[PDB]
């Protein structure tokens, strides 16, 4: 099994840490949800190919422009995350996160991931965003952003329900294997 490296980037509100936790346990924690993620090496078999996929979080590094790039060397695939409950997290993708990743990770595939998809039809979420003249990110808004930024693809998931999470990491593995 060949080794590949994945890094997840995005705003603090995007749910990156939770996504890594749920994938690495195949479980939304029932007793305690960790504050932090250290690292993990997942055994993945995708389309008949065995990979060891090393997983890294950038949480805590968002304010530190010289520390944060130390996460990027030899990355094989980037997950670029926003939350569907935060249009603000999507607006920060094209001109903050994207130019940084293209600079430090040239030619590395980017998957744009809409997290927290369970909240798109959540009444509390809709009420709260309406007060800032906002609504949950629409699937077409996600796809259009992915298209614009030169993403490999666009995917959605819910760490809470686990729906879509396996598929995100299997696809990231496929992307990392491409020449």
């Amino acid at each position: 099994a060949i080794r590949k490296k994945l890094v997840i980037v995005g705003d603090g509100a995007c749910g990156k840490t939770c996504l890594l936790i749920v994938f690495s346990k195949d479980q939304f924690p029932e007793v305690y949800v960790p504050t932090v993620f250290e690292n993990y090496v997942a055994d993945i078999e995708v389309d008949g190919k065995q990979v060891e996929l090393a997983l890294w979080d950038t949480a805590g590094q968002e304010d530190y422009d010289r520390l944060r790039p130390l996460s990027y060397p030899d990355t094989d695939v980037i997950l670029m995350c926003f939350s569907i409950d935060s249009p603000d997290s999507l607006e920060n993708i094209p001109e903050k996160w994207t130019p940084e990743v293209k600079h430090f990770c040239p030619n590395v595939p980017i998957i744009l991931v809409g997290n927290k998809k369970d909240l798109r039809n959540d009444e509390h979420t809709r009420r709260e965003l309406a007060k800032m003249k906002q609504e949950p990110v629409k699937p077409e808004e996600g796809r259009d952003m992915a298209n614009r930024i030169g993403a490999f693809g666009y995917m959605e998931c819910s760490a809470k329900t686990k729906d879509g999470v396996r598929e995100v990491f299997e696809m990231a593995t496929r992307a990392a294997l491409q020449a």
Binding site: V31, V36, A54, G60, L67, S71, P73
Partner: protein, 245 residues
């Protein structure tokens, strides 16, 4: 890690580490606070273990087994003895606070009520100056270490065999050389996240709320200073490239 500490921090949470009859005696807010304090200490134990892999398994094994050129092992593992001393001392203080708080007759049932003071001490004065000096140096040598590692792995058969041998066991799956370097660089930026969540559950005693507020600000001051003090070293970089930064 030593077995006593590994066992003490084997559970996924404080609420699963303590006896259920002890848990049932506490309010939910206390349980939430203790769970995050437990995560701070558990992840500190694992960080010290990362540093012991670096010093004892890799660095010392290379010195004992291989014929590397002078300065190569220091280039792979910059500042690792200093980092081990900083964090082993901090860990010792956290574990002594736990042990003092244990109920007589128990090796598992405790509540830590006074963490803020310990964190203020760690992140101020000489210890904070040493943390800042050592991380500014380490993080500025990070790129250089990774590049040296990759060169030796690709070119030196005995080095490659050494690495494959000592990283074969399952318990080293997450702790190759490059993985250890990045775990150490990322440790310092975990502290604000942890401290802020402890603080969220520490409003019951106003002195504690205040102390954790002070600690959080000291940690952010340290991180800002380290971040402003980093410039990546590169083997073979010429003066002109540096002064034209």
């Amino acid at each position: 890690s030593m077995e006593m500490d590994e066992k003490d921090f084997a559970a996924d949470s404080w609420s699963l580490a303590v006896d259920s009859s002890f848990l049932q005696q506490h309010k939910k807010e206390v349980m939430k606070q203790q769970d995050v304090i437990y995560e701070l200490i558990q992840t500190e134990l694992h960080h010290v273990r990362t540093l012991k892999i670096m010093t004892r398994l890799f660095r010392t094994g290379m010195l004992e087994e291989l014929h590397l050129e002078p300065g190569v092992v220091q280039g792979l593992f910059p500042c690792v003895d200093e980092l081990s001393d900083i964090h082993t001392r901090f860990l010792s203080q956290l574990l002594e606070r736990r042990r003092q708080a244990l109920c007589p007759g128990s090796t598992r049932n405790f509540v830590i009520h006074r963490l803020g003071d310990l964190l203020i001490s760690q992140f101020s004065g000489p210890s904070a100056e040493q943390m800042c000096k050592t991380y500014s140096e380490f993080c500025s040598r990070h790129s250089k270490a990774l590049k040296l590692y990759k060169e030796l792995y690709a070119r030196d058969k005995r080095f490659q065999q050494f690495i494959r041998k000592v990283t074969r066991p399952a318990v080293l799956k997450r702790h190759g050389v490059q993985e250890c370097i990045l775990l150490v660089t990322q440790r310092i930026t975990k502290y604000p996240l942890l401290i802020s969540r402890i603080l969220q559950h520490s409003h019951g005693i106003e002195e504690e709320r205040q102390d954790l507020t002070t600690a959080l600000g000291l940690v952010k001051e340290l991180l800002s200073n380290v971040d402003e003090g980093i410039y990546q070293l590169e083997k073979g970089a010429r003066l002109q490239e540096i002064y034209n930064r």
